[PDB]
Amino acid sequence: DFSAKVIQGSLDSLPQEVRKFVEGNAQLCQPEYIHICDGSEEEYGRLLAHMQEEGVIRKLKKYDNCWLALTDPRDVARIESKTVIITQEQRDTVPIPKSGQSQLGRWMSEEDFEKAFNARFPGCMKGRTMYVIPFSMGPLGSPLAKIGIELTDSPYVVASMRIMTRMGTSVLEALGDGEFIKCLHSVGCPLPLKKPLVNNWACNPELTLIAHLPDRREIISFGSGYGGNSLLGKKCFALRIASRLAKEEGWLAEHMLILGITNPEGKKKYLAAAFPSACGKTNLAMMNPTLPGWKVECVGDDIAWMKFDAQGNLRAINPENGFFGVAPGTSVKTNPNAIKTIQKNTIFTNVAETSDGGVYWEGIDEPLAPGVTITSWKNKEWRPEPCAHPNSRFCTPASQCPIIDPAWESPEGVPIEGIIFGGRRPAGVPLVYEALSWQHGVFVGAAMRSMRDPFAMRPFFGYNFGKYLAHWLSMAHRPAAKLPKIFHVNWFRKFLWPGFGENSRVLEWMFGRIEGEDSAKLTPIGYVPKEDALNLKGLGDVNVEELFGISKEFWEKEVEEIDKYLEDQVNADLPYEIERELRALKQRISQM
C-alpha cells in the first residue's frame, strides 16, 4: 500500500487498472512521493518554480512565462541504437534482411528485455517523486483519440507533457475503466546520487533504453530525460505503438503534417504530408502563401492519425497538443508564424541565451542588438562550434499558432483529400508529380530518400515494414473508400525553385488536380503539371524545362537502387503489388 506517499490526488479515486499500474511500479521503483497530476495552471506554475529553485530550468525574462533547460551533453537526442521493440517473433517487428542489419527497426526478445529491465528499474526512483500523468492523444473524448498514463520521475517531462498532450483530471474522468497505454519513464538516478550530476540534468547514458511492448500495450523508457525518449506520447505512443494499433484496427498512424488550404473562393481542402527532414514539415504546415487570396492553416506539423469514416472519407486528427520543433533554422524571416507561436508559455531546451533574457540559435536570421552577448547551450560565452545544439528544441502550445486551423480540435477529424511525400534531391526528381494510382502512390512512399526513409517512418515503424506496406495497399479494398490523390514533391532540385511561400503555387496545382482539372501531362514516373499549368506570376523566368525534366539515365539508376533496397530490406515480406509497380516503372523507363 502506497496511500501514505500520495502528495496530490488519491489512489482510491483512480480506476482500478490505473491504480494497479501506479502501485505496482511504485513497489518496483520505490519513489518517496506519488503525485497524481491534475493538469491545472497552479500545478504547472509551482512545478516550474520548483525546477527553477533546483537549477533544472532558467526563466527567460524577455518573454511571457518562457523557460530554458540545458542538458548533459550525453543526453541530447533520441538514440536509435538503444530504441527497441519487443515481440515474440522478430519477423513481426522487422523484416529479415537478405544481408547485414535491418535499417527498418531494432528488435529485442522478451527474455533480453527482462534482464535489462531488472538491471535498471528496481529502486530507480528512490528519494524522488513519481508523477502520474494521465493524458489523451487527440481531442478529449474524440472517437479517434487514445489515452495513456505516464509514470515519470522528471518534472521536466510533466511540464513538457502538459504542453504536448491534453493531461489532467479530465482525462481520468474520460478514461474510466477503459483501456489505456501504460507508459513508464525514469531518468535512472536514484538518490543519493551514485554518479555526479552534470548541469542539473539527471540521466543514465550507459543504461539508456527506450522499449516498446505493443502486445502488452506498454512503453518502458529508462536513462534519458530528453524529448522522444522521455515524452512518451510523442514518438513511442503516437507512431510506434499507434501504428501497431492502427494495423490491428484498420487505420493509419503516420509521420505527417496536416494542413488546411483555402482557395480565393473560400473552398477548403485538407492535405497530409511526410518529409524526412526536420524543418520541412513546419515550413509547409505554417506557410504564408504568396498567391493572392489563398490561405494555409495548421492542424499539426508532425503526427497524423487517419481513419476512414462510414462515408469513405479519410479523416485525420492531430493527436498532439503542441509543437516540439527543432529550434535551429527557425527563422524570423522565413518562418514568422513559428516564431510568433513561441513568444510565450514555451519551454526551450539546449538553445542559446542572450544577456537580455532572450533565445538564440543558428539560422534565426535576426542580428543581435548592440551590447547583447550570447551564452551558449554549454553555459559559456559565445562569439560568431554552434551556440545552440543542432537538435535543440522549443516546446510550445499548438493553440498559440497564429494560423492554427479552426478544426484542429474537431473530434470527428478533418477530411484528407491528398497525401504528399517529400524528398530533397539535387538532380533528377521534378518539382512535383502525382501518382498514377493508389498502388503506385504506396510505392512512391516506399521509394523516398534525401539514408533512405520510406514514409518518413524509418526510425518509427512499430511493426514489419513489409506488412505496413500491405496494410496501406489494403485500403484500396475497403468498401466505398475515397482514396486520397498521392503526390511527391522536391523543392531542392538544382536551386531552380525559390520555395518557402512560393510552394503555395505547387499546392494550387494539387488542389485543382483533386477537383479533377485536366492540368496534368503523363510521364513514365507519374503525372506532372502541363505547360502553363502552374501560376508563375511574380517569379520572373523560372526554368520549367529543367525543373520538370525526366532523364532516362537518372531514372534507370533510381529504379535499380530502389529494387536493391527493397529486395535487401523488405525481402520476403515485400507485397506483390509493390514489386509489380517497381517492374512497371522499370518497364516505362526502358521504353523512353
**Binding site residues for substrate, as ranges?**
78, 226-228, 277, 391-393
Element spanning 401, H or E: none
Pair type for strands 33-36 and 352-354: unpaired
Which residue numbers belong to the known binding site for Mn(2+)? Answer: 235, 255, 302
Q: Tell me whether residue 86 or residue 202 sits nearer to Na ion (CB atom).
A: 202
| From Na ion, Mn ion, none, interface partner of 298 (C-beta below 5 to 8 A by class) | none
Distance of closest approach, residue 68 Cβ to Na ion, in angstroms: 8
What is the DSSP annotation of 432-485? EEE-SSHHHHHHHHHT-B--B-GGG-TTT-SS-HHHHHHHHHGGGGSTT--PPE
Could you list the residues known to form a binding site, using ranges. 78, 226-228, 235, 255, 277-283, 302, 391-393, 424, 500-503
Q: Which does 200 bind (CB under 5 to 8 A by kind): Mn ion, Na ion, none?
A: Na ion
Decide if 147 contacts 136 (C-beta within 8 A). yes
Which residue, 94 or 239, has its beta carbon nearer to Mn ion? 239
Q: Closest residue to Na ion, Cβ-based? A: 200
Partner residues linked to 152 by β-bridges: 131
Region label for 562, one of left (φ > 0), alpha (ψ between -120 and 50) or beta (otherwise): alpha
Say how far apart CA 465 and CA 574 lie, in whole Å: 8
Which residues are paired to 40 by β-bridges? none
Binding site residue list for GTP: 278-283, 393, 424, 500-503
Work out what residue 302 binds among Mn ion, Na ion, none; the CB cut-off runs from 5 to 8 Å by kind. Mn ion
> What, of Na ion, Mn ion, none, does residue 133 touch, CB below 5 to 8 Å by kind?
none
Please state, in angstroms and rounded to a whole number, the distance separating the CA atoms of residues 562 and 582. 8
Pairing between strand 252-254 and 304-308?
antiparallel
- List the interface residues with Mn ion, window 284-303 (CB under 5 A): 302
Residue 159 and residue 177: Cα distance in Å, rounded? 26
Strand runs (DSSP E) across 3-70, as ranges? 6-8, 33-36, 58-59, 67-69
Does 153 contact Mn ion by CB under 5 A? Answer: no
Residue nearest to Mn ion (CB): 302
Q: Whole-number minimum distance, CB 157 to Mn ion, in Å?
A: 17
The binder of 8, among Na ion, Mn ion, none, by C-beta within 5 to 8 A per type, is none
Query: How many residues touch Mn ion (CB under 5 A)?
Result: 1
Identify whether the C-beta of residue 357 lies closer than 8 Å to the C-beta of residue 64.
Answer: no
Residue 26 interacts with, from Na ion, Mn ion, none (CB under 5-8 Å by kind): none
Burial of 251 (0-12, 13-18, 19+ CB in 10 A): buried
Nearest-approach distance from CB 76 to Na ion, in angstroms = 12
Strands 107-108 and 83-86: parallel
Give dist(CA 71, CA 379) in Å, integer: 10
Least Å distance, CB 199 to Mn ion, is 16
CB-wise, 317 or 470, nearer to Mn ion?
A: 317
Catalytic residues: 279
Q: What's the min distance (Å) between Cβ of 195 and Na ion?
A: 16
Select from Mn ion, Na ion, none the partner in contact with residue 199, using the beta carbon and a kind-dependent cut-off of 5 to 8 Å.
Na ion
Yes or no: say if 55 and 71 are a contact pair by the CB < 8 Å rule.
no
List residues binding Na ion (CB under 5 A).
70, 199-200
Binding mask 331-370 for Mn ion (x = CB under 5 A): ----------------------------------------
Rounded to 5, what percent of the chain is helix, strand, coil? Answer: 30, 25, 45
Q: How far apart are CB 234 and Na ion at their closest, in Å?
A: 21
Give CA torsion, residues 358, 359, 364, 366, to 10 deg: 20
Q: Which is nearer to Mn ion, 297 or 302 (CB)?
A: 302
Residue 70 contacts which entry, Mn ion, Na ion, none (Cβ below 5-8 A, type-dependent): Na ion
Which of these, 567, 592, 561, lies nearest to 579 by C-alpha position? 567
Q: Cα(211)–Cα(585) distance, rounded to whole angstroms?
A: 39
- Which one, 78 or 440, has the nearer CB to Mn ion? 78
CB of 302 or CB of 508, closer to Mn ion: 302
Distinct helix (H) and strand (E) counts, the chain: 15, 30
> In the bound complex, what is the minimum distance in angstroms from residue 460's beta carbon to Mn ion?
8
Q: Which residue's CB is nearer to Na ion, number 379 or number 543? A: 379
| Closest distance of CB 502 from Na ion, Å | 41
Three cell numbers written together for 347: 519551454
- Kind of pairing between the strands at 295-300 and 347-349: unpaired
The least distance separating Mn ion from the CB of residue 255, rounded to whole angstroms, comes to 6
Of 197 and 592, nearer to Na ion (C-beta) is 197
Cell 548533459 -> residue? 72
Where does residue 588 rank: exposed (0-12), middle (13-18), buried (19+ CB within 10 A)?
middle
Residue with smaller CB distance to Na ion, 77 or 407: 77
Which residues of the shown chain bind Mn ion in the complex (CB under 5 A)?
Answer: 302
